[PDB]
């Protein structure tokens, strides 16, 4: 009977919560209080990328840390040469209402989708030289919120259908569906090994998934509201999570717990997008209030602010080289930030 | 700058020229979001404008007086609206279609309208109210088993406004009902917005051909209001 299952669910929830509290010997803030604080991080808009006709939802750096897709609700993907600001490609989209894109780690493919539940895979390395749709991954029953390539043949997808799916692009079929969420899945970060991923899903829960096992291994639930953004820490053992609750939270996979909350009283709006730096020492979070804050992930201090956008920030990619953070906004502009010494 | 780097800049400029032609089309096109419950008959508004001029979004593109309108009916999405609705910041309007006859779901439609209206990302987006199924409202008021005052105790206090221009042969009970439903949406419309966005009620039926004309006129008077506000004229 439902009441007995509800009581068993509450009991197991209390067992999980007790095991977490039992392994909460000390907070991250206590361990890092001896660390010298990071100085005032200043980043200086080394590039502004212009050509999108509308809001940008998403970006993704190439592994080359030089090419950059951004998806705009104009209905264009643009491939940017960041070093030159050159447009490498502008890809017309069948649906304007794009909400995610991913650049493949090989750079052979780019993916995008949105309010049309298709995940379109675009082949950049085409012998005809035009970019073309290689596969329309159709079978999602709600909007495509995040996509990330594991390999040129495999993409994991997240949807407004409270679901994730791994696809084999050769077939266009879900090789695994991930179905333990209850809200709209909003963001997806692949682990550095690409064996695990975390997704945050409008239920204030993050879930760790095993790509091969098809199963939820951990649910992390420190957030108060919709996790809009998720990013693995570069060690792959922790990940950060930006919420509508105006807080970022860092979760360790293994301690199964929130390590720190990144919040300040002056900040009362949702975190739109999250990325770590290459060391993990800098945690960058984009906000609805038109700017991106930099957090000391260890000390939870605002090391700085990227205050250069005019409309809602929407996406936030750090290069795999760490040489820059790119910031996209609803103002159609696409800003690349480093600093100087 | 090397010969290849120069030629890549020239490709970037070729792309920027195509993107400018697309800027011309994107600004010449007016984008609309069509919202409404399963009762609303938004599907019939679509069918009208389609004929006469697992997919998650249904574009309808129609033209009135050489002006291109793209109207997006939300397709196969879940009933959790709050995330995908943020895509429609920078539409010209949201056409909110209401089933005026469905009093038990009229409060549901009012809470939807109030949520759409008060959303941070729609704070600048005006709403075209299609109060639809007005034939069925007239029938339900004349064949008056269903009493609005059972659902809206304000209706017993409400009196038809001097604004009201009922069609000839309309019973004043049908007028009082339909204008009450309108003012139930307008009391939401008028409670916040600081003039950044406005609400444009229309009484509609499926048989109406003039819904495209209504949308044309409302989009005109929205862009007019926006510019007159930018010019400190309104």
């Amino acid at each position, epitope marked *: 009977e439902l009441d007995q299952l509800r009581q068993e669910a509450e009991q197991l929830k209390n067992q999980i919560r007790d095991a977490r509290k039992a392994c909460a010997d000390a907070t991250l803030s206590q361990i890092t209080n001896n660390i010298d604080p990071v100085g005032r991080i200043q980043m200086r808009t080394r590039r502004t990328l212009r050509g999108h006709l509308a809001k940008i939802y998403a970006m993704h750096w190439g592994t*080359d840390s*030089r090419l950059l897709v951004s998806a705009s609700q104009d209905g264009k993907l643009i*491939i940017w040469d960041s070093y030159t600001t050159n447009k490498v490609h502008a890809i017309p989209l069948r649906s304007s209402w794009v909400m995610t894109c991913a650049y493949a780690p090989s750079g052979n493919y780019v993916a995008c989708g949105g309010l049309d539940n298709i995940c379109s895979i675009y082949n950049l390395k085409t012998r005809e*030289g035009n970019v073309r749709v290689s596969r329309e991954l159709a079978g999602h029953t709600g909007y495509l919120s995040c996509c990330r390539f594991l390999d040129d043949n495999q993409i994991v997808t997240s949807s407004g259908d409270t679901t994730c799916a791994l696809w084999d692009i050769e077939t266009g079929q879900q090789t695994t569906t991930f179905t333990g969420h209850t809200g709209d899945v909003m963001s997806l970060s692949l682990a550095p090994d690409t064996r695990l991923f975390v997704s945050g899903a409008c239920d204030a829960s993050a879930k760790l998934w095993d790509v091969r096992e098809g199963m939820c291994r951990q649910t992390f639930t420190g957030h108060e509201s919709d996790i809009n953004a998720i990013c693995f820490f570069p060690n792959g053992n922790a990940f950060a999570t930006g919420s509508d609750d105006a807080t970022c939270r860092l979760f360790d996979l293994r301690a199964d717990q929130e390590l720190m909350t990144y919040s300040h009283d002056n900040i009362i709006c949702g975190i739109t997008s999250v990325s770590f730096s290459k060391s993990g020492r800098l945690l960058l979070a984009g906000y609805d209030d038109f700017n991106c804050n930099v957090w000391d992930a260890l000390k939870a201090d605002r090391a700085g602010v990227l205050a250069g956008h005019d409309n809602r920030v929407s996406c936030l990619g750090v290069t795999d080289d760490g040489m820059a953070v790119a910031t996209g906004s609803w103002d159609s502009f696409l800003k690349i930030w480093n600093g100087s010494s | 700058l*090397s010969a*290849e780097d120069k*030629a890549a800049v*020239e*490709r970037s400029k070729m792309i920027e*020229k195509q993107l400018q032609k697309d800027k011309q089309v994107y600004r010449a096109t007016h984008r609309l979001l069509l919202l409404g419950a399963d009762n609303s008959g938004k599907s019939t508004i679509v069918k009208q404008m389609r004929i006469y001029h697992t997919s998650g979004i249904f574009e309808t593109k129609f033209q009135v007086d050489k002006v291109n309108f793209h109207m997006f009916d939300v397709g196969a999405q879940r009933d959790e609206r709050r995330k995908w609705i943020q895509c429609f910041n920078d539409v010209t309007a949201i056409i909110f279609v209401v089933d005026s006859s469905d009093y038990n779901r009229l409060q549901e439609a009012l809470n939807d309208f109030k949520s759409i209206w008060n959303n941070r990302w729609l704070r600048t987006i005006s709403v075209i109210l299609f109060l639809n199924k007005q034939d069925l409202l007239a029938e339900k008021v004349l064949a008056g088993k269903s009493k609005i005052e059972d659902y809206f105790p304000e209706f017993a206090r409400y009196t038809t406004p001097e604004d009201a221009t009922p069609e000839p042969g309309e019973d004043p009970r049908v007028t009082r009902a339909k204008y009450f439903i309108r003012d139930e949406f307008l009391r939401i419309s008028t409670a916040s917005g600081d003039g950044r966005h406005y609400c444009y009620p229309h009484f509609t039926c499926s048989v109406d051909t003039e819904n495209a004309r209504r949308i044309f006129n409302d989009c005109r008077d929205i862009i007019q209001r926006m510019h007159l506000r930018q010019y400190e004229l309104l």
Partner: single-chain antibody, 230 residues
Framework: VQLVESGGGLVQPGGSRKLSCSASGFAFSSFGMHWVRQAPEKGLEWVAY????????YYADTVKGRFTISRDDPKNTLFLQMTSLRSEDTAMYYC??????????????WGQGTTLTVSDIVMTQATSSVPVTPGESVSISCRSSKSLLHSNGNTYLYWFLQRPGQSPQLLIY???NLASGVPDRFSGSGSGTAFTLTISRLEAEDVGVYYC?????????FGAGTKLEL
């Protein structure tokens, strides 16, 4: 992808021919196009370039005042209107596509060529021919007057194979990048002023003339070519 060239034939000195190159199976408008010619027993020589959308045109000084390169993107076709033709212009003319963006491969497809019979950096391939055996590892040297290493870091040597009856095929672009269809047998390296193409396990399909080319600055220049003889 197909490029097929027409309008060659016999013509008198002083005469004129319009070579027409017709493009099919690729986005012709998006490619810059080149004409490269080959005198009957001589190396490649670049003739003319027309950018995507015609915004840039360049010629060799041997043709600069006297050939004009043009394209009809709607008809997917390229023209070389030649005038004041000379014995020097007696050559196989190859229609060559190029696309230019970060990571592009210029010169990645060459048409079958049209033969016309009329009745600046130096690239040195110091060996005109190497006698070779199958399965041998062979290195083809090339030298440039100027260092092709540009400050953008692209070391810039191109490598082509022309097989005895085929048009040239791009093997490697910008010193070291292997072309999409080309076996991993091929690998290129160099300093910027001096270069090698290694061919790690020669097949019979690797016989032909190997041309190095620079794309640092126009006019584009080709080496004399190194023949490999099985």
């Amino acid at each position: 992808v197909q490029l097929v060239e027409s309008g060659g034939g016999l013509v008198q000195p002083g005469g004129s021919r319009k070579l027409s190159c017709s493009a099919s199976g690729f986005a012709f408008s998006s490619f810059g196009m080149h004409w490269v010619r080959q005198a009957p027993e001589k190396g490649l020589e670049w003739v003319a370039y027309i950018s995507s959308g015609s915004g840039t045109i360049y010629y060799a000084d041997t043709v600069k005042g006297r050939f004009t390169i043009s394209r009809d993107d709607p008809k997917n076709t390229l023209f070389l209107q030649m005038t004041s033709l000379r014995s020097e212009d007696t050559a196989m003319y190859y229609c060559v596509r190029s696309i230019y963006y970060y990571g592009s491969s210029p010169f990645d497809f060459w048409g079958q060529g049209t033969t016309l019979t009329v009745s600046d950096i130096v690239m040195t391939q110091a060996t005109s021919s190497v006698p070779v055996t199958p399965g041998e590892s062979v290195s083809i040297s090339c030298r440039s007057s100027k260092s092709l290493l540009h400050s953008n870091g692209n070391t810039y040597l191109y490598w082509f194979l022309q097989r005895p009856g085929q048009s040239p095929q791009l093997l490697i672009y910008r010193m070291s990048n292997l072309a999409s269809g080309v076996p991993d047998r091929f690998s290129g390296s160099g300093s910027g002023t001096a270069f090698t193409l290694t061919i790690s396990r020669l097949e019979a399909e690797d016989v032909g003339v190997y041309y190095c080319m620079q794309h640092l600055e126009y006019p584009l220049t080709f080496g004399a070519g190194t023949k490999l003889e099985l």
